[PDB]
């Protein structure tokens, strides 16, 4: 046989997945319904909520609350920077790469990255802030004002077709793996190298989707459009993103952040 | 001489809790505003001051398409209209959050705002505002006072007054702590008709105005007269305020297309 170094390379991918993110699916979902070791998360609903959740569970309080809110959120999306970029790495062959390449590979890859992984903390409800321990509500976030109201919708609205595909944490880690590994990135120096690494990461992708989902045999398939959702995702959240730099005098941006965004 | 007690302590507690409220509730203020027009804010705001730059202000900054094929004059009252409902709910809050206010009768309450929404109004509309034109769509477009001259009659005559209060008010130099105080002053006002309970309103004023007073002396000791200078432009304010009140009824009665704002219709109702 010749697939057993595919199913091999499957299962090291997701080890590094496992070794890299604090937050998982599995993590998540026993949160999310209710079979945690101690105590539910707290619901942040309402602006008392929010400052309750400001002063207990995370570590700026003088701005509006959109302001506040999204500082957190940037605080959340470097955290998971760190750890796509230690991912990354641990991926077979990244590290060969072309060293620019590299850069180029997960400067427009880790929002791709980060909202596919968000979906997993998201119901339609709302979703897992706070390391865990919060909920942020859905309404709560679309009470906000103009365009802070905007922004987390098209998040959730992705997530919810996402979750419908029922994907575990070695589904995930080999779709993250293939959103990196990608040949369509501009300004890429050796575009071959790439897609040669590509076709391995998403050959094993689709032979572990068979074993794991032989319910959905065009599982495959319809990853492969989230795939394209989430390129479209990733472009209208840039443009919303530069409205509130635009627009917004007390809204600032973490400098990795405004790095990665620039010249998309 | 002596330490302060805890009487003063207790006026600088209450200007810095009014202070507190009014950045809390209030998107725009001076400060904010000033950086805009300053030119030190980075995009800098779509200016208005002709037919072709209010058509391409309203695709970018406003979304109303109900108002599209109206006259330009019209269309701008509307405008106006969005602002000035949402000044309405700011100061309702604000004052909400003025110690002593929510112990008030509740009807007296919506009283107080009732007749004093429109002056504090265009007391804060100041700080948007300079000697050539005012910041609107929350500081990302300024529509030039030239432009407000240009329109047709009634139209025209409508913000001009306003300017030239502004202009007058703005050359007291108040900072934000100062005006959040005067705000504080114009609605707790005893002296607003059909107050159930004006003797509890009395002894509010008589307190709010007693910190304003405190603080302006602490705040510009330079200018002693600046509290009576302030009370003179109460006056000028409520005179503003029955002259605007007035020109929406020259609108209200012989302008074909020019409606108002239900909750508006309500304030400006047996005024
Ligand atoms: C209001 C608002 C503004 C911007 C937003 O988006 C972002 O800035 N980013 C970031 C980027 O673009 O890099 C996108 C993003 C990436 C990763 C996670 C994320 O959401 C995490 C989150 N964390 C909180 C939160 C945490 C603690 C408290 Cl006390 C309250 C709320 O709320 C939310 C939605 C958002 C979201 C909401
Ligand atoms: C022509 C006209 C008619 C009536 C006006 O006055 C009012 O309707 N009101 C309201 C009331 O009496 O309740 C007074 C008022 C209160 C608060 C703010 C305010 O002006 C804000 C403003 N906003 C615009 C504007 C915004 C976006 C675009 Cl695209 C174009 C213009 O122009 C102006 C002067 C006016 C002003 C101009």
Redesign the interface.
């Given at each position: 046989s010749e697939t057993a170094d595919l199913k091999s390379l499957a299962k090291r991918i997701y080890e590094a997945y496992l070794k890299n993110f604090n937050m998982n699916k599995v993590k998540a979902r026993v949160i999310l319904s209710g079979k945690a070791s101690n105590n539910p998360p707290f619901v942040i609903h309402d602006m008392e909520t929010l400052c309750m959740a400001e002063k207990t569970l995370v570590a700026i309080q003088n701005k509006?609350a959109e302001v506040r809110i999204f500082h957190c959120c940037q605080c959340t999306s470097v955290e998971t920077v760190t750890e796509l970029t230690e991912f990354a790495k641990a991926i077979p062959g990244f590290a060969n790469l072309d060293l620019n390449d590299q850069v180029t590979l997960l400067k427009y890859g880790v929002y791709e990255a980060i909202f596919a992984m968000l979906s997993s903390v998201m119901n339609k409800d709302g979703m897992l802030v706070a390391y865990g321990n919060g909920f942020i509500t859905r309404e709560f976030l679309k009470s906000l004002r103009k365009p802070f109201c905007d922004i987390m919708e098209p998040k959730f609205d992705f997530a919810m077709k996402f979750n419908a595909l029922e994907l575990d944490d070695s589904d995930i880690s080999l779709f993250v793996a293939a959103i990196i590994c990608c040949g369509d990135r501009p300004g890429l120096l050796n575009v071959g190298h790439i897609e040669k690494m590509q076709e391995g990461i998403v050959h094993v992708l689709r032979l572990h989707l068979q074993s794991n989902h032989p319910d959905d045999i065009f599982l495959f398939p319809k990853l492969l459009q989230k795939m394209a959702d989430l390129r479209q995702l990733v472009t209208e959240h840039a443009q919303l993103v530069q409205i509130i730099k635009?627009?917004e005098?007390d809204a600032a941006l973490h400098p990795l952040l405004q790095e990665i965004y620039r010249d998309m």
């Open positions: 509006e635009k627009t005098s």
